[PDB]
């Protein structure tokens, strides 16, 4: 069981005032644990999981200072990118950043990330080697050259391989009773006649954690993809997730169509039919 920590941030310019909207969220695996919203009254990092509440005032002060600094960097960068791309002040633009790290079962570093987007498209990202950058265009390469000259990668790598992993380990221990759980999917099939020729089968997976799951159909033992539908995995709102997969079949031939459910919380995959 590997684990991840991720911070997601979004700054959106507001031409009418000049103060961007900044929203940052932190996750361990599929569980959110902190948020910051510049529109909120607190102007501080806020807890969103019970196991972060035990952190003292020094944690909240430092996290708030850091995230506010991040918001200010984004604010300056919105202006810089307007310059690089020759855009006017009239339109709203967006900077998004995702960063964080993965650890293995032994709690040791696996992978690190820092990826940036402008207006929903790649801008610049740290490569997997944590020593080089991928710029999407020549504007982003201005940034790349700046970060190369400043040796930013070595500083970021220290965070990703050090601070990020050690704090992920702390959170996993402090929240172990919920973060290190697996909730297996509860499964069932529904069935809806369409016509004298056709019927719908819908295979359900409910109440599972983490969110990763695979639902597949087979017809007479071979994977079936034609005439199928798969919805995005969705949050139930209580920390667990849901998903369904459907297939249109000849009426009366439902016995040929098996749904297969794979999830980390299942000892072996489940198969089910109407």
């Amino acid at each position: 069981g590997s684990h991840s920590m991720r911070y997601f941030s979004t700054s959106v310019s507001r031409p009418g005032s000049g103060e961007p909207r900044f929203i940052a969220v932190g996750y361990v695996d599929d569980t959110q644990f902190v948020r910051f919203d510049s529109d909120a009254a607190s102007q501080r990092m806020e807890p969103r999981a019970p196991w972060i509440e035990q952190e003292g005032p020094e944690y909240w002060d430092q996290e708030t200072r850091n995230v506010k600094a991040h918001s200010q960097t984004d604010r300056e960068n919105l202006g810089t990118l307007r310059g690089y791309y020759n855009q006017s002040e009239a339109g709203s633009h967006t900077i998004q950043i995702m960063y964080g790290c993965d650890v293995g079962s032994d709690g040791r570093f696996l992978r690190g990330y820092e990826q940036h987007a402008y207006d929903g498209k790649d801008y610049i990202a740290l490569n997997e080697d944590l020593r080089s950058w991928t710029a999407a265009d020549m504007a982003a390469q201005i940034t790349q050259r700046k970060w190369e000259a400043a040796r930013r990668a070595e500083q970021l790598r220290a965070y990703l391989e050090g601070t990020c992993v050690e704090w992920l380990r702390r959170y996993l221990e402090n929240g172990k009773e919920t973060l290190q759980r697996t909730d297996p999917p509860k499964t069932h099939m529904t069935h809806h006649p369409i016509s004298d020729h056709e019927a719908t089968l819908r295979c359900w997976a409910l109440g599972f954690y983490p969110a990763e799951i695979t639902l597949t159909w087979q017809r007479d033992g071979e994977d079936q993809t034609q005439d199928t539908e798969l919805v995005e995995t969705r949050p139930a709102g209580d920390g667990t997730f849901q998903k369904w997969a459907a297939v249109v079949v000849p009426s009366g031939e439902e016995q040929r169509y098996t749904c297969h459910v794979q999830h980390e919380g299942l000892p072996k995959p489940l198969t089910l039919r109407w």
Binding site: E63, N66, L81, K146
Partner: peptide, 9 residues
């Protein structure tokens, strides 16, 4: 916990 700071583009 967060990065101490990000960087200017």
């Amino acid at each position: 916990c967060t990065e101490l700071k990000l960087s200017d583009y």
